[PDB]
C-alpha cells in the first residue's frame, strides 16, 4: 500500500507515474479511464481493427457508460491466452444495442465505436505481469476497469514495444 498512500500536500491520492494526476481512492483518474478487453477470437479482433467497432458485455456496460459520460475512456486489447498486446483505442460513442458486431452474443449489451491509437500483435512480459495481477493481484477479468497507473503503463509499454520492433 505505497501506491494507495502516495499523496499530495492536500492528502489527495496521486498517480505514481505522473504526480500531476489526482486519483480517487481506488487509484482511478477523473479524466482518463481504462478498461481491459481479453480477446479470444482472431476473427473478432481482425474485424474490430478494420471497422473500429467493439462489443461491450452486460456485466460491464453500466460502468463503461458511466465513464464515457464523465471522462475519456480507453480500451486496451490483450489476447486471452497469452496476454499478447493487440492495441488500444479510445471509446468514441455510447453503447448502441443496434450496432453489434457479428461475433457478439447474448452476453453483450451493445456495441461502441472506437478510434484506434495503436494496433499490434506482440508479447510484452511487463504487459503480461500487469494483466496477471489486475484484479487485486489476481488475473484480469474481461471488461474490468484498471487503475490509472496500470493503464498508463500498458499504453507506454505498447508504444515502446511497437517502436522497438521497427528500430
From Swiss-Prot:
Residues 32-158 form the YTH domain. Disruption phenotype: Read-through transcription of regulatory lncRNAs (long non-coding RNAs). Decreases premature pre-mRNA 3'-end formation of ssm4. Increases levels and cytoplasmic localization of mating and meiosis specific transcripts during vegetative growth. Decreases heterochromatin formation at meiotic heterochromatin islands. It is found in: Nucleus. Disulfide bonds: none annotated. Component of the erh1-mmi1 complex composed of mmi1 and erh1. Interacts (via N-terminus) with erh1 in a 2:2 stoichiometry. Interacts with rrp6. RNA-binding protein that recognizes and binds N6-methyladenosine (m6A)-containing RNAs, a modification present at internal sites of mRNAs and some non-coding RNAs. Functions alone and as part of the erh1-mmi1 complex, to recruit the CCR4-NOT complex and the NURS complex to target RNAs. Suppresses the meiotic program during vegetative growth and promotes the meiotic program during mating. Binds to DSR (determinant of selective removal) regions in meiotic mRNA, and recruits the NURS complex to targets. This is RNA binding exosome specificity factor Mmi1. It comes from Schizosaccharomyces pombe (strain 972 / ATCC 24843) (Fission yeast). The lineage of its organism: Eukaryota, Fungi, Dikarya, Ascomycota, Taphrinomycotina.
